[PDB]
Amino acid sequence: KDWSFY
Amino acid sequence: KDWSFY
Numbered sequence: 086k087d088w089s090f091y
Numbered sequence: 092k093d094w095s096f097y
């Protein structure tokens with residue numbers, strides 16, 4: 086699991 | 092825009 090910003 | 096974690 087990982088982060089995204091959009 | 093916003094942060095997501097998956």
Ligand code: NA
Nearest residue numbers: 086087088089
């Ligand atoms: Na990250």
